[PDB]
Amino acid sequence: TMTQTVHFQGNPVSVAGKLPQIGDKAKDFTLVAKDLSDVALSSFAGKRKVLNIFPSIDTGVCAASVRKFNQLAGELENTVVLCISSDLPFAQSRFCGAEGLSNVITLSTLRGADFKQAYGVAITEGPLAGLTARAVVVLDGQDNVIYSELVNEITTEPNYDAALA
Amino acid sequence: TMTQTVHFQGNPVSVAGKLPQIGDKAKDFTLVAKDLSDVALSSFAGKRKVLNIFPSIDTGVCAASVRKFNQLAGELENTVVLCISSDLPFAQSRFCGAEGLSNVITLSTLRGADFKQAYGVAITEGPLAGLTARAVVVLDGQDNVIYSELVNEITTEPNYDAALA
C-alpha cells in the first residue's frame, strides 16, 4: 500500500498505488466500451497505446485532453488512444458524439475498477475519492512502459508533446 | 444473497438483493452530491422522499424520469426528489444544468456503492453489470416504505401516478 500526492490547485490528495514507470510491464486490464462490451489491453497487442486517464470527461481540462488526443490521433503511427475514466460509458459516448470525435476509444471503469490501484490511479481521500487521477501512460505492442506521467496539479493538463515518442 | 429478475426489452438480468417493500424501514445511505459533498438519507429526516433510481441519466427513458419528477416535484408537499444513479455527479449536473431542472436533487453512487445491494438494486450480470436497476421507492419522514417499485422491463418508465400517496 504505497501512496503518491497530487494536488487540487494546491492541496494534498492521496492516490493509491504507484504509476507504472519506464521499463515496467503494465498490468493487463479490462474496461467497458461504448457498446457495453468488455475490452482488454490484450486486444491491442502489437499496436502501441496512449492511455489518457482523467477524473471526468464532463470536466473542463479532461475534455480538452480528449479533443487534443483525438486530433493528435490522426497524425499518429500504429497507435490507439484510449480515453479511460471514471465516467460511465454513456457520458463518454455523448461527449464524443456531440463533439464529433471518432479517432479515440472510450473505456469506462464501470467494470474493471481494480485498474485504478493496478495503475497507481485511485484517489482515496477528499471530495475526489472514487475517481481516477489525471495521468497519461504510453505503452508499446507488448505493454511496456515507453512513457508515463502522473500530473502534479490536476487543474493543469498533461504534457502531450513532450513527451511523445 | 437473494435475486430478482428484470429484463432488457425481454431478457433475464440478475439484480442482487431485494427492494425494500411496504412496511420495511429503508436502510440509511450516503451518496455523492453535485458539489462532491457526501449526503445521507438522515439529512432529510421529517421530509418525505422519492427515490428515482435508474441505470443512467444520459440514457433515454432515465432522462424522461428526471424531467417528469422535476416537473412533478413543484406540485408536491413536504417531499424531496432524489435522482439516484450510477452516473458520476458531473454528468448528473450537466444534464440538469442543460435542461434547467432545479427542483430535483442528484445523488451519485460514485461513493456509497453498497446502496445498490442495500436497496436490491445492483445489476450483477450482462452488459449492465455495475449499474443500478430502474426503480422508484418512496419513504416517509422516518425512512419507512410508503411505496416501492422495481420495474420489470428496464425499457419502460416507472409508474409515477399511480402509485403516488
Numbering used by the authors:
A (entry chain A), B (entry chain A): 0 to 164
Please share text taken word for word from the publication where this structure appeared.
Tpx constitutes part of the bacterial defence system against reactive oxygen species (ROS) and, correspondingly, is upregulated when E. coli is exposed to oxidative stress. Atypical 2-Cys peroxiredoxins are functionally monomeric, in contrast to the typical peroxiredoxins, i.e. the resolving (Cr) and the peroxidasic (Cp) cysteines (C61 and C95, respectively in the case of Tpx) are situated on the same subunit. Tpx contains three cysteine residues, two of which (C61and C95) form the redox active disulphide bond. ypTpx has a regular thioredoxin-like fold: a seven-stranded β-sheet, with β2 and β6 running anti-parallel to the rest, although with an inserted N-terminal β-hairpin (βN1-βN2) absent from other peroxierdoxins.
Crystal forms 1 and 2 grew in conditions containing DTT, and the solved structures were in the reduced state. Crystal form 2, diffracting to 2.35 Å, comprises a single subunit in the asymmetric unit, the complete dimer being made up by symmetry operators. As there are only minor differences between the two reduced structures, with an r.m.s.d. of 0.4 Å over 160 Cα, only the highest resolution structure (space group P21) will be discussed here. There are no salt bridges or covalent bonds between the two dimers in the reduced structure. The partial unfolding of α1 opens a cleft in Tpx formed between the loops connecting β1 and α1, α3 and β6, and β7 and α5 on subunit A and connecting β1 and β2, and β4 and α2 on subunit B. When in the reduced state, C61 is orientated into the pocket where it is available for oxidation by H2O2 or alkyl peroxides. During transition to the reduced form, the loop containing G59 to C61 folds into the binding pocket predicted to accommodate the compound. Similarly, the side chain of R133 undergoes a significant conformational change. Collectively, these conformational changes reduce the overall volume of the binding pocket and are predicted to affect the binding of ME0052 to the reduced state of ypTpx by inducing steric clashes. In fact, MOE Dock as not able to find a suitable docking pose for the reduced state of ypTpx, presumably because the binding site is occluded by the folded extension of the α1 helix in the reduced state.
